[PDB]
Every structure is written in C-alpha cells, then in structure tokens.
Amino acid sequence: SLPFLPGNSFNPRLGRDKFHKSQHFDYSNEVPMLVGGHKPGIGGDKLLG
Amino acid sequence: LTLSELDELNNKRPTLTYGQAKQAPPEDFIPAHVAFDKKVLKFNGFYKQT
Amino acid sequence: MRECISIHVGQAGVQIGNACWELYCLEHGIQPDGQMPSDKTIGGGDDSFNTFFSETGAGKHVPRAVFVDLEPTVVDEVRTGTYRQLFHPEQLITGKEDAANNYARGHYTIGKEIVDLVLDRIRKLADQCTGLQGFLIFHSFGGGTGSGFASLLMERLSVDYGKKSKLEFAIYPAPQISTAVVEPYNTILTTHTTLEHSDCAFMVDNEAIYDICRRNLDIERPTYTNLNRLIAQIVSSITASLRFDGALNVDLTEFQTNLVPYPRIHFPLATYAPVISAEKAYHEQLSVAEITNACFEPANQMVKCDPRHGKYMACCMLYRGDVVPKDVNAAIATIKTKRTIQFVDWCPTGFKVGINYQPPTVVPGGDLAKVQRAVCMLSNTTAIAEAWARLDHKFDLMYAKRAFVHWYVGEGMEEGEFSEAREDLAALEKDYEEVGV
Amino acid sequence: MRECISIHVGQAGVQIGNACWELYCLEHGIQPDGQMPSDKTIGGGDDSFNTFFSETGAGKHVPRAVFVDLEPTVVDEVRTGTYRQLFHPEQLITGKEDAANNYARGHYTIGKEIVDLVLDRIRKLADQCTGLQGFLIFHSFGGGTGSGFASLLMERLSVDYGKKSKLEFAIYPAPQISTAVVEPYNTILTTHTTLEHSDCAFMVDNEAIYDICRRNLDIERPTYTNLNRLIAQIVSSITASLRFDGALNVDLTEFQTNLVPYPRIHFPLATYAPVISAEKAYHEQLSVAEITNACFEPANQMVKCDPRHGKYMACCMLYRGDVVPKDVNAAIATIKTKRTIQFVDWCPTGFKVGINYQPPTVVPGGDLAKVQRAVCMLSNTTAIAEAWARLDHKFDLMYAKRAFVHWYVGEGMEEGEFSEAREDLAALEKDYEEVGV
Amino acid sequence: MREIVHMQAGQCGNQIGAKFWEVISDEHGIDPTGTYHGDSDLQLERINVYYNEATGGKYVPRAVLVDLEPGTMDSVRSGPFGQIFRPDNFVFGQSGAGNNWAKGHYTEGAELVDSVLDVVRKEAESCDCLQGFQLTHSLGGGTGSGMGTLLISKIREEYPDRIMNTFSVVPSPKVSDTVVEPYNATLSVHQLVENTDETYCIDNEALYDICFRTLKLTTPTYGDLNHLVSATMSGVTTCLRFPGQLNADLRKLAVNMVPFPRLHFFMPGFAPLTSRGSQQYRALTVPELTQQMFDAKNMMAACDPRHGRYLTVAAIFRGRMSMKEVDEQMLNVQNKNSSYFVEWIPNNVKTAVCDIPPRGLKMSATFIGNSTAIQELFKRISEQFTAMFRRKAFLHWYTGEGMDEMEFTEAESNMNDLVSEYQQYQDATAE
Amino acid sequence: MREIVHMQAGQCGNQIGAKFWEVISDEHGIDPTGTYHGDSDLQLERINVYYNEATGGKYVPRAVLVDLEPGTMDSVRSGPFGQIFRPDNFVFGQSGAGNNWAKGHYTEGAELVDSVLDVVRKEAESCDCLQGFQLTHSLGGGTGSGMGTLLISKIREEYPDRIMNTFSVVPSPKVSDTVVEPYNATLSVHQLVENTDETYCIDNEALYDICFRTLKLTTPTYGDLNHLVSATMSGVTTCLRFPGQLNADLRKLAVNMVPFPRLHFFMPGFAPLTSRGSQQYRALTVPELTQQMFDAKNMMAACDPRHGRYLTVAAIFRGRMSMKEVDEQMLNVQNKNSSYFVEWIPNNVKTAVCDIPPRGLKMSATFIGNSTAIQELFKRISEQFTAMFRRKAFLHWYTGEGMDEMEFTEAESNMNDLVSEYQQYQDATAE
Amino acid sequence: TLVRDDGALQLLDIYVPTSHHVHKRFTRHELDDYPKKDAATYWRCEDYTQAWGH
Ligand SMILES: Nc1nc2c(ncn2[C@@H]2O[C@H](COP(=O)(O)OP(=O)(O)OP(=O)(O)O)[C@@H](O)[C@H]2O)c(=O)[nH]1
Ligand SMILES: Nc1nc2c(ncn2[C@@H]2O[C@H](COP(=O)(O)OP(=O)(O)OP(=O)(O)O)[C@@H](O)[C@H]2O)c(=O)[nH]1
Ligand SMILES: Nc1nc2c(ncn2[C@@H]2O[C@H](COP(=O)(O)OP(=O)(O)O)[C@@H](O)[C@H]2O)c(=O)[nH]1
Ligand SMILES: Nc1nc2c(ncn2[C@@H]2O[C@H](COP(=O)(O)OP(=O)(O)O)[C@@H](O)[C@H]2O)c(=O)[nH]1
Ligand SMILES: [Mg+2]
Ligand SMILES: [Mg+2]
C-alpha cells in the first residue's frame, strides 16, 4: 500500500497513549504570532523545522 | 499471490516505472552561416613577377 | 507554390493539427526538426512541399499553420511534443482562460483579446506566400473557442482576405453521442459563419467515425487519435491534387465550382473510403469499383445521416494512386445505374472526377492498411438536413424553458441572437428540403 | 584612413562604450588584451580596424576612445575588468567628485577642472589621427556628467575643431519612466546647447528598448546589459560603412547632408531590425522586405515616439549582410505606396540607403542571434515634437514653483538660462510645426 | 497560468484541507520539507496552480487557514505536511465562537474578516489570472459556517467575475453532531445560494456508508473521510493541472452544469472504491468505473438520486481510456435509466477526460451530480429548523448578540423557495 | 576618492554608531581586531570612504566619538567591534550634561568644542576629497542635541560646501523617556534647519512597531532597533562605496530629494523585513521589495504617510536585479497612488541600483521619503513645547545657564514656520 | 535513461500523455520498414514525368 490512495492509510495513533497538544499560535499582546517553532508536535514528538 | 506471480513485478514493478520512459533527444539544426561563422582559412603566397 | 494556410482553432483543431502535420511531414519527407534528407521525399518532389512548408533559405521547413487555443494546455503539449522544433513559436498561440464551452466567452469577451494577434500571424503567413490558394480551418462545434472564437476569426478572414477560398473541416455533434450539455446552443449560434463566411463546409461526426473505426479497422476501442488520423487522411487526399501530379487534378476552386450549385448550399459530405485494417485488406482486391462502391455505401460516411433519404447533387471524386481513368469511368457508370443512388433532376452530369498519381502515405503505428488506391468523395446531398433537424430539436427542447441561457446573456450576446440563429437554421433547412423535392 | 574617435561621457556613456568596444573587438577579431590571435583569422584586410583602433609597432591595437566621468566608479570598473590591457591609461580619465545630477555643477564648477585635460587627450588622439571624419559622443540626458560636461565639451570642441562633425548618441528620457527628478531641467539645458553645437543626435530611449526586449527578444525582465548591446548594434550598423565595403557606402557627412534638412532638425529616430533571438531566428526567412517592414512598425522604434502622429522628412536605411540593392528598391516601392506612412510634400525622394556586405556580429553570451541580414533605420519625423512638448509641460510644471532651481543658481548659473532653454525649445516646437505644415 | 487559491474555515475545513494538501502534494511530488522530489516534468509544469515559489526551489501552498480559535490549527501544524504552509496565512482570533453562526458572522468573528481579507488579497495579488477561489467548511458550526459565508460574501463583492466554489460538509439525516445545526445550515444556505458559483455538498453519513460498504475499512476514523473528500477535490481540479483529451476547468463545469442560477448544490462521487478483499474479484474497466460512479449507494451525500431527476451529470475521468467506450457508457446509462433524467435536456452528461490518473491507479473517475434530490436535504433542514423555530429553541443565543427574527424568516423563505424551484424543475415536462 | 567622516554625539548617538561601524565592518569584511579578513576585492577597493589605513594593515574608522561623560564611550569601547576605534577620538568631559540643552550648548559643551573641532579638523585634513560629515545623535538630550548642534554649526562655518547629514533620533509620539524632550527638540531643530544639508528623522515607536508587528522578535531590545538604523545608514552610502548600475551618492540624493533648502527632513525605510519563521517562505523579489517600502508600517519616524503627500521618494536598491522592474514598480506606485504625490513635480522618485547587496541577503532596498507627513511630528512637538512653556515649567534649568525665553519663542516660531511651509507645499495646486 | 520504443513496461508509465505516446519521433527502422513511401503504380512503372513529385 505504498501509493497513498483513499482507504490505503491506516491508523497511526494505535498504541499511543499521550496526545498532548502544544500552543503554536498565541497573541503576544494584540498582534497574532506563531509562538511555536520550538514546541513539539502531538505527544511531544519532534517536528521537522 | 503465488510464488510464481510474485517472482516478477519485484523485477517489473510498475510503480517504479513512473517517468522512466523519456523522450528521444532532439538533434539540433543550425544554418551553415552560423556553423561556419567567422571561420577563415589563411594561406601564404609567393607571386613572382618580372 | 500553391500554398494553403492551415488554421487550427480549439482543442479539436489543435489535436487534428497534431495528427495532420505529422502526416504532412511524413508525406513530404520533413523531419520533426525541419530538414529533408532526400530519401523521404517523393521522387521528383524537390519543391512539392511548397504548399504546406516554407524554406527559410537554409533548410528549415516551417509549416504554414496557426494553432490557436485560449486554453494553454494542449498547445503547450504541442510545444513539448515531438514537433517541438518544427513550429515557429509565434505560430502556436494561447490565451489565459478558455471560453469554457461558451459562445459568448469565445466571441465577445476573452476571445476578443488575441484575435488580432492571430490575424497578424495569418497575415505574415499570407504575405510570405506567393500563390495562396486558401485557408483550411479546423475546429469543432462542441463549444467555446471552437465555436465563438472560430466564428470571430473566420468572420474577420472573410471580410479581410476575400477571394481566397476558406475551407472548413468542422466537427459536428452526434445524434446521441455528446461530451457536453451546451453543444446544441454552441452549434446553433455558429451557423451564420459557416453559412455566410465559408466557401465550403465539410463536416464530420465523431459517432460516425467511431462506427467506421469499429466496423472497418477492427478497433473495438477507438479514440480521438484514430478519428483525427482519418480526418487528416481526408484532408491529405483533398489537397494532394495541389501537391503532386495527376491527370485531371483539381485546384480547390475547381471542385467548389463543380460542387456547390448555389451560394447557400455549401455543406457536403466527405468520405475517404479504402478504409480497412490490414488483416481485412489481405482478403480483398481493393479495386477501383470496390473503393468507389464503398463511398456510396451509407455506412462509411463521416456524418450519421444515410443519403438514401435524400438526393445527390454533385459528387467530386479525388482518386489517388494507380487508378487509370478507364476503371473510374466504369465505376461511375455502375454508380449511375445503381438503384438506391438517386441524383437530382437538374444535374444530368454530376461527377467531377480527379486523379492524382500518388498513393497514400501510411504513418507507422497507424491503423489503416497500406493501399495503393484511394478515393475521397465530396458529395452534396439533401441528407445533412437530418443532422440539421436533430440539432434543431435538441436546441428547441432546451430553449423552450431557457436552460443555461444566463451564462450566454451575462457575457454579451443579447437574447435575440438565439432566435436569429434558429431562424437562419430554419431557412437553410427549408432551402435543402425544397431542393430535395 | 577614415578613423573617427569617440568620447564616452557619463556612467551611461561609459557602460554603453564598454558594450560597443566589446562588439568592435569581436567584429575585428581583436582579443581583449589588444592583440590579434595569430593562430586563427577573423578575416579581413589591413584597414578594417583602422577606424577605431590605431596600430602600434609591436602589434597592439589601442582604441580611439576617451572614457571620461566625474565619478570614480564606472571608469575604475572598466580599469579593473577584462578590457584592462586594451585601453590606454590616459584614456580612462576621471574626475574626483561627481556632478550630482546638476547641469550647473557639471558645466561650471567640476567640468572646468578637467575639460582642459580632456581637450589635451582629444588633441593627442587627433594628432596621430590623419583623416578625422567626426567625433562620436556617447551620453545620456540624465544630468551633470552626461549633461553639463558633455555640453562644455561640445562648445570647446566646436571652438577647436570648427568644421569637424560631432555626432551624438544621446539617451532621451522616457515620457513616464525616469530615474532622476531634475531630469526635465537637465534635458532642456542640454538641448539648449546641443542644438547649437551638434550636427546630428541619434536619440535612443530606455522604455522603447524595454518594450523591444519584452516583445521581440522574449526577455520581460532585462538589465542595462541588453540595452547597451542593442545600442552597440545600432552604432556598429551606422559605422560599418567606414570599415567594410558594400554596394552603397554612406559617409559620416553623407548622413548629415541626406538626413538633416535644416540646421535645427538633427534629431533622427533609431530602429533596428531584426531584434530576434536564436530560439526563433532560424524559423524565419528574415528577407529584405520583412526587415524593411519591421522598421516602420511603431512598436519597433527605439524611442517612445509614434511616427503615425507625424510626417517623415528623410529616412537613412543601412542594410548589412546578404542584401542585393534590388530588394531594397522593391521594399521602398512597396512602402512609398502606403498612405499611413506619410512623407512631407517637399521631399519626393526621402530615402538614402547604404548596402554593406558584412553581416552583423553576434556577441557570445548575448541575446541577439546570428542573422544573414539586418537593417538600421534613422528617420527624421515631425512626430518627435510631442517629446519636446511634454518636456515643455514638465519644465513648466516644475519651473512654475521654482523647485530645484536653487541648486542650479547657487553654484555659478544665472536664473535666466532656464528661460533661455525654454524659449529655444518653444522655438523648436514652432520650427517642427513650420516644417511639418 | 490558470490557478486556484484555497481557503479552509472551521475545524472541519481545516482537517479536510490538511489532507487535501497531502494528496495534491503527493500528486505533484512534494515532500513535507517543501521541495520537489518528483518523477516527471508533468508534475511541475502546472505546479503553479496550487503552489508558489518561496526560495531554494521550495513550493508553498496558496491556502488561507481560518479559525476563531487556534484549536485545530495547532493539530494541523503539529501533524505531517503541516510545515509546508506559510505561517502568515494562519489567521486566527482569540475567541472561539464554535457552533454559533451569529457569533461567527456579526459579532466577534466579524473583526477577523479584515485580516483574513488582507491575507486573501495578498495571496491573490501573486496571481497572473486567478482562475478561482475554493472554500472547505461545514454547515454545522459558527466559524466554518458563519465566518465562511462572510468570506464568501466579501470575496464575491471584491471579485464578481470569478469561480467561487465551496465543498462544505452538510448536516446529516442521522445523529446531530451539533444541536443548533438546523439554525446554522438554514442561515448558511441562504448565503450559499446568492453568492457561491457551485457547492459540492458532502455528508458524513454517506462517507461512513462508503467506508464500510464499499471500502470495508473496519476502523475508518476521520482520515479516510477527509481522504475521500480530498480525492473528490483532486478529481475535480485534475484537468486544470494535467493534460487530457477533453480538458475541463471549473468554469467549464459551471457552464455544463447549473442551468438556472440558484441550483448549484451537487452530490459528488468517486470511483473506483474497491473492497478490502475484493480486488481479485473486481475488474478495473471503464464500464465498471461507470457503474460504480452512477451507483446510487456510492454518492457522498445522503440524497437518493432515484427519488428525483438528474438535471446534469459531470463525469470527470482520468487515465488511458477510449473515448468511444466512455461516451458509449455515458449515453447508455441515460438510455437505460431515462426515468432519472430530465427530458428537456438532451445528453445530461458532461464528460471530461484527463491523461494522468492518481498514483497507483490506472484509471479513476469522479461524479458531480446536479439532481432534483438535494431538495430532500433542504426539506430535512427546513423541517428541523421550523420545529425549533415554532417554539423559539436556542434563539436567545442569536437575539442576545444582535440577530432578529427577520433574518431567520428570510432565510427560511428563501430556502423553501429553493425547494419549490427544485420540485418545479423535477416536475417540468418536455413540452 | 569620495570619503565621509563620521561623528557620534551623546549616549544614543554613540550606541547607534557602535552598531553602524559593526554592520559596515561586516560588509567590508574587517575583523574585530581591525585587520581585513574578507574574500572580495570590491570590499578593499572603496574602503577609504570610511577607513584610514594605519601602519601594519589595520583599518581605523574615521569616526569621532563625543560625549560629555565617559561612561557611554567606555561602553562603546567595551562593546564588540569597539576596539577598532582610535582612542585619540574619544574626547570626554569631566561633568555631565544632565539632559539639558544649555548644559551642552552655552556651557560645559562649549569648552569641549575646541577639542572636538581640533580632532575633526585633523580627520578632515587627512583627506583628498571629503564628501561630507555624518552626525548620529538624538533630539531630547543635553549633549545629543546641544553639543550636536554646536558641532554642526562650527563645521558648517569651516566647510560650507560639503554634504552634512544628521540621523536625528527625534522624540516620541507617545510616552516620554525624558521630560524636557520638546524643549530640547525645539531648541535643536532650529539649528538643524539652519545648518544641515539633510536630516533623517527617526522614531523609537515606529522602530518598535517594525520590530514587533513585522519582525516579531518578542522582546526586540535596543540591539535590533539599532541594527535597523545601521541598515539605513549603510544603504544610503552603498552607492558611494560600491559599484552599481545607477550610482547615487549624498549630493545626488540631496539634489533629487529637496526642492527647497528647508525641506530636508526625511523618514527612512529598509525593506527586506521578514520574520525569522518566514524567511524561507517568501520570494524576495523587486516587486515585493517595492510593496514593503511603500507601506505605512515600514517608516521609521511615525507619521503615517497618507495624511500628507510625497514630495520626493528615493529608492536605493542593493542587489543583482532588473532596472525594468525597478523603474516600472516606482512608476506603478505613482500611477496607483497619484493622489499621495505632489502634482507640480513629475515622477517623484529618484532610483538607484548598486549591484552588491549587504552580506546575507540576495537583494535589499532603502527608502528615503521627503513627505509632508512630518507636519504631524513637528506640530506635536510644538504643542508639547507650548504646553510646557505657557506655564514655564523646567525653564529655570535652561535660564540659569545664560539663555532667555527669547530663544525659546524664537525656536517655536521657526518650527511653526517649517510646519506652515510643509502645509503650503502639501496643499498647492499645479495651477 | 531509456528512449521510448513502445515497451511493455513503458506502457505502464502514467506520466507520458496519450498525445506524446501516439505522435512520436519515428526512427530510421520505423521509416525504412513498411511506412517507406515506395509503392508501385501504373504511372510510375510506365515512366511518366517526375514533375511536382510523382
Ligand atoms: N475528432 C475529434 N474531436 C475532438 C477532439 N478533441 C475534441 N473534439 C471535439 O470537441 C468537442 C468539445 O469541444 P472542444 O473542441 O474541446 O472546445 P474548444 O474548441 O477546445 O473550446 P473550449 O470550450 O474553451 O475548450 C467534443 O465534442 C469533441 O467532439 C479530437 O481530438 N478529435
Ligand atoms: N541604456 C542605458 N542607460 C543608462 C545606463 N546607465 C544610466 N543610464 C541612463 O542614465 C540616466 C541617469 O543619468 P546618468 O546618465 O546615469 O547620469 P551620470 O552619467 O551618471 O552623471 P551624474 O548624474 O553626474 O553622475 C537614466 O535615466 C538611464 O536612462 C546604462 O547602462 N544603459
Ligand atoms: N468529514 C469530516 N467532517 C468533519 C471533520 N471534522 C468535523 N467534521 C464535521 O463538522 C461538523 C461540526 O462542525 P464544526 O467543524 O465543528 O464547525 P466549526 O466550529 O465552525 O469548526 C460535524 O458534524 C462533523 O461531522 C473531519 O475531519 N472530516
Ligand atoms: N535608537 C536608540 N535610541 C536610544 C538609545 N538609547 C537612548 N536612546 C534615545 O535617546 C534619548 C536620550 O538621549 P541621550 O542620548 O541620553 O542624550 P544625552 O543625555 O545628551 O546624551 C532617549 O529618548 C532614547 O529614546 C539606543 O540605544 N538606540
Ligand atoms: Mg479546451
Ligand atoms: Mg554618475
């Protein structure tokens, strides 16, 4: 099932128990900003950039 | 799939043939006034006289 | 030097051009890069290319064509394909947005932006030539650029060039097969330019060519490639009398004079009919009588209307290859003494026979057998009114409760244009039926 | 024997001259160090280079140019670049402080501190000269070095060499595109003093070359390199008659006597044909009729001036390459029948042609292609009055409020010189009107 | 270079777009870093339809991400293919209206419309011709529904010549997933009718039925649902990006569909959707693609096409297929099921074909059906709305912020007029 | 060989020149030790503009560092790239200014004036061309304002032809940071108008806005805020010290920008200003440079340039780019916003392109605008000065050093004259 | 890098369009076999004139 396709994409969350989010977006004082860039992804896994 | 039919397509594998059939390279055409542009043959002469 | 300019409008025009200039290059020996070696030329050819291609003086044979399409997809596929270096870059012309099956978007907005550029390219190709015979225009009535923009373009050629003959190889909607919904509207709206801005208006039907491909060439699954190859064979058989030698070779205006009886009647049928696969051609003579009877067989026509319900008015045969006139005369006598072929009473002699000493060329990978004799028959019949009436009824069923009209109204094209086009269609139908009776 | 030295003044003049001298070295086969290759031949006699290069005893071809600028940047870039061993070190002469877009600064304060040295260099060039046919002066109408110092050099050269011709290759500001803000002041003050001390002034605008590079060369984002290469092609086509023999040879005095009707109208347009690229050059015949018709197109003019709004006085055609002096007559006969191209009623024969056998030289790493033939069109039109009129409009718009006048008046310039320039240019308006009607 | 700018509104639209920008990135050979690890030049030749140059040969989406609270956009950024988006299109508020159309339209959602309009204008400025605007949202919330319709109204005001089309997940006949979705849907459809060029209404119940009945798919989650929706988007926009024998842009679809301007709610479909263990039993041919395309239990909406008449049907094909077979099947389904087709439109089926299928498949086909059976959906929502409105259930959450009963009555009247129009065009005869 | 001497006056002037001489040393490839560790000869060619070649190969800045107290000069000598300065140009005073303009003009700064003129005379004598004099200072201080104006007056007396440019951090629209700021600014702009050839007004609030709303940075501190001024000071004279397609030195900028001798107050701009998380997402092109320059946010001295009219705008580009897009973008801005330009000056933009960008960018741009929007700043300073002067608050601290209120009512009147002249040249018709 | 030569595995490529697939650069072998334009006719075997291409 190497090509992507509808239905050929299984559950990647099976077995995971920590689904902690992270607040990538937050108003600093009145301006919207991306306060992320160093915060991890879902469950604390490392991002790419 | 049998071991017969799995023996090929690990060798054929149409997913790995994507974009592999490429066009024939086009040989260029140049006019003879560009190919032989600024190409002069120099010879040295004698030209005796009386 | 009997030059003709080929203008291919729309996606159907451009794909016919791809299947047609391939045949022209392979017939005249032109490489896809633009040179004649010597070998692939016709024996004694030398300048026989000089009605489709032009010398640059250095060896380059630039085709005398204008590919136009408002959508930049298929023309850039031409620009990417194997005839990349063959065409001048200005000969292939694109817009930004296509007309989207809308005659208004092809004729009033959008399409009224590059028509002058196309006309300038046509003018350059025209004054490059010395003996311009005319313009062959390839488009479809499916809609948009092939109807609206081709209408505008052929209109401006009609008012500009004048005495030049403007042949039309139009693609017609089928009785039942159709790839779009607004084809009746887009086909009704463009009958004026085929009626009063064209000198001859050869028409082909995709369903008819599908049926011919399924019965004759044994292709149970044909496609647009085979359709355009058959159309290109028809046009090559028409134009070869301007290119090679022959006994009674015709020169465009010759079969126009021998074909159209009246100015309003210029909508004939075109049948190339040694059409056969190689396996089936292995079991027939493919003689002159066979290839003449195959033209009048009402199952080898490229418009789905059998002429047994109408009367023939003028048949022009264009024979190719080893076709001695002594067999053509016997074939014409057999056709005349046939039961079901009925000629009109005011045409005692109605056969313009032309012979060319050049058998058809075959494209590698093609589906046609390599025969040595060919017939392209152009017949003016009172049976295209069947297709006119089918179009008329499919248009009336929609215009009764005004479906899809807001798209046409919101882009120019005041509401009375539909009624005017319907009225002139009815006038043309009345003319054909009163000629038939 | 027919050498004619050049003076490149200003940054625009220096960069244009760099492109020009690269073109001349490639034309005459001189390597950038100033030596012939001695292992291959470009082909030629012994005096083809003896109009721009003066031969030394060792075998080095030092040129005949004076590169002068009051700013030490562009001339030092020339001194550091690849043509560093070609020019003589006392030709790349440079002031110490820039003239700062200020005609008064370039004409009264900084220009007079170096005009003696530029006259000394010009005199030392003219002493080893023997057959001086004129001075080429390359500059822009920008301001300061190209305006004031060029003006001062015009008066000093007119005083020293009285009857010697002084041709200008002047860059005119576009109607809308301009860089400096005091450009109307600089242009009117430059015209005020070049109208009295120049024999002919070829104007080459920037926006017109931008349009030409966008449409013809298929470069919608050019730099000054392509513009300078096209101006180099223009001047090379003008001066090729002094280097290569042809069917009809036009001398530098022949341009003035057959292009300038009255000694006030010496502002011809510029046009090159074909400005074509290698991707589309080899697909065209590029015949004499085509390249002649491409000269009179309004979009192909090298100045932003529509010739349809005025009347032609005289056109100097310069054909280079594979040109027979029969197709030129045919093209002129076809052009003179057109009612759109309007000539003045007092000039029945308004054409002077020069046929030359040497084709234009393609620059490697450039944008133009190697063409069999080309043509340079220099026309005197009454349509050029609109540029002067809109310059009057800009000058009035700024001089009404006396903006930027303090910079000129505070450093050695009376306030009445602006009004003197204005009334001379209004007199020039009236002169074009009188010679037009 | 004709090209679409994309917008996602609400959490449903955000999760739909987060997989749409995966499927078209895999179609165009875009790795999650943003570069082009493609296989052919016919993957980058029309990559500008959805992507923009950034630097180093990297392509950014031309997508605008909208929410009133960064709840789902944190998950979008944290998930895979979430670092390709430019971090200036993430337009968010600090509020989170959620499931109040009024709060997403008139109050607190309405101070974000200026910023999202600014970023949409900035994205559209980097466009030579700007073929269309597309929007993914849901008619069951307040940010997807209300702010989405506000975006549609503003975009239709700024550019009244452009193909503005929406997909939108419409409320379901079974369950609710939201109590106030009758109010949200009847207030959103009133804005969809007057503004959008076409709407491809998607139903989660039909998606669940497609997952179990046609794809087996024992645990579907929302990933397979969003994948089916995204495959429908890609099949719709395929002919704008890849060459074919019969090209069809969104304007061509709009011309060869809606005949009367207020009928543009379509039931989409996809083929082939072969079961988990039925691939050795199925035959991948054009007739089987046509059968699964026109099968009534294969649409992605819960409106039965056999309870009405097909006004128009757009079939968009992808692959190496014979045009005679394709047109023969398109004619044959109408000839064999002429009861579910309007007689006053001959050849109700627009046909398009493209040469490039999705990767891993030889052929594919998408269904877009304008039928007189979406009136069932509008009747369901109208009945569920009037049952609440005749007792003023949950109306204080709207009247307190500033709505009045006049807007509700106008929306209900317009929606019932739309129902009557669909019924009239179903019952219309040939002559 | 054109060359400019540089002066830093006061605490703010020293702290800004500290990073000016660091950014341009990074541009010229000069090590913090003082030697040359570059890689291009274009750096070493025009290096005598700002540096003197000392014995041994070390390059010394041609800068004089002036402060009435030694703490800030110890700080700049202790900072990075602070050991390159010659300690003979580090003149200090024993006492302190105390943010008093009189204490720095009519007292203790008037005894250090002999030493600063001796040092500047030596530095300007060791020249061959002497293009001009830069003064980096702030209005709202004692030695930043009073000593700076004394320096400009004396140098204008000695050399009344060379180009004199001051970079003038002018006080704030909101908040204070100093209580006597309108007093100091009113007393200083009199001398600035009378003496300086050109003045680049700078606001800390506009700088904070461009480091926060555009450049993010969370905490922007003073280092980034001084880097954004050093970028402008480098991009003004990049055409002087680097080759280019179109060169434009200080006298070209002055001649093209000022129409009248008193209208020489400019607001600056630098516009590859992108967030750190958005550098890899942006296509750095000439049109986007033009859009970022001609934006009301990007000005560095408040004064939203839509309440007035652009008399002249200079655009100094640094990078390998296209003059066609340069001139067509400058023309497109004028054609689209012709109401915001004066109608009696055609083409109110002076352009320049100088090939070599700053180290670390492929291209950059510098904006210099002589708008009529600085009437707001001068009117605000006049209003604050009148408010503090009607009740005569903090006036004894200035009148105890010898001044009288004749000078205050002189300076306020001349500021009002400047405001009236800008109003007149704003609302003046062409006819 | 392999040139298109109508291969069974090259028929499985989904990234070459049908137009490029059917309109292809014909080779020396493909033009020297049966599509070679030699064809015996009466008008050529009886040596008629070779004007205009025969
Ligand atoms: N015989 C043949 N017909 C074609 C071909 N391509 C398209 N057509 C016909 O064209 C009709 C569709 O209209 P198009 O020609 O594609 O429309 P257009 O001229 O490209 O203008 P647009 O509507 O803007 O795309 C179909 O009904 C086909 O019958 C082809 O390759 N061969
Ligand atoms: N074609 C072309 N034009 C140029 C070039 N460089 C400058 N110009 C023109 O020159 C004008 C600007 O004035 P300049 O000629 O550069 O002034 P200058 O010669 O540098 O003299 P100063 O202003 O005193 O420094 C612009 O409007 C350009 O059109 C060039 O390299 N090529
Ligand atoms: N197909 C699909 N539907 C979704 C998804 N997320 C939410 N929905 C639907 O959206 C509806 C809720 O609306 P919601 O998205 O919360 O509106 P919002 O508050 O404006 O974002 C529910 O009926 C869900 O069925 C998704 O990822 N895929
Ligand atoms: N740009 C910038 N401005 C500064 C800095 N430090 C102080 N200032 C400003 O300078 C003003 C004080 O002027 P100051 O240098 O103390 O004058 P002085 O007391 O005479 O030396 C304050 O209003 C600050 O806003 C700095 O590092 N950078
Ligand atoms: Mg099309
Ligand atoms: Mg200069």
UniProtKB/TrEMBL annotation, chain A:
Cellular compartments annotated: Cytoplasm, Cytoskeleton, Flagellum axoneme
Job description of the protein: Microtubule inner protein (MIP) part of the dynein-decorated doublet microtubules (DMTs) in cilia axoneme, which is required for motile cilia beating.
Protein name: EF-hand domain-containing family member C2
Part of the full-length chain shown: 2 to 50 of 744
TrEMBL record, chain B:
Compartmental location: Cytoplasm, Cytoskeleton, Flagellum axoneme
Name this polypeptide is given: Flagellar protofilament ribbon protein rib74
Range of the intact protein held here: 51 to 100 of 645
UniProtKB/TrEMBL annotation, chains E, F:
Cellular component aspect of the GO annotation: microtubule
UniProt-listed InterPro entries: Beta-tubulin_BS, Beta_tubulin, Tub_FtsZ_C, Tubulin, Tubulin/FtsZ-like_C, Tubulin/FtsZ_2-layer-sand-dom, Tubulin/FtsZ_GTPase_sf, Tubulin_C
Subcellular localization: Cytoplasm, Cytoskeleton
Major site of localization recorded for this protein: cytoplasm
Every Tubulin/FtsZ GTPase domain range: 47-244
Bilayer-spanning residue ranges: none
Assembly with partners or alone: Dimer of alpha and beta chains. A typical microtubule is a hollow water-filled tube with an outer diameter of 25 nm and an inner diameter of 15 nM. Alpha-beta heterodimers associate head-to-tail to form protofilaments running lengthwise along the microtubule wall with the beta-tubulin subunit facing the microtubule plus end conferring a structural polarity. Microtubules usually have 13 protofilaments but different protofilament numbers can be found in some organisms and specialized cells.
Protein's name in the database: Tubulin beta chain
Origin organism lineage: Eukaryota, Metazoa, Echinodermata, Eleutherozoa, Echinozoa
Automatic annotation (TrEMBL), chain G:
Protein name listed in UniProt: Uncharacterized protein
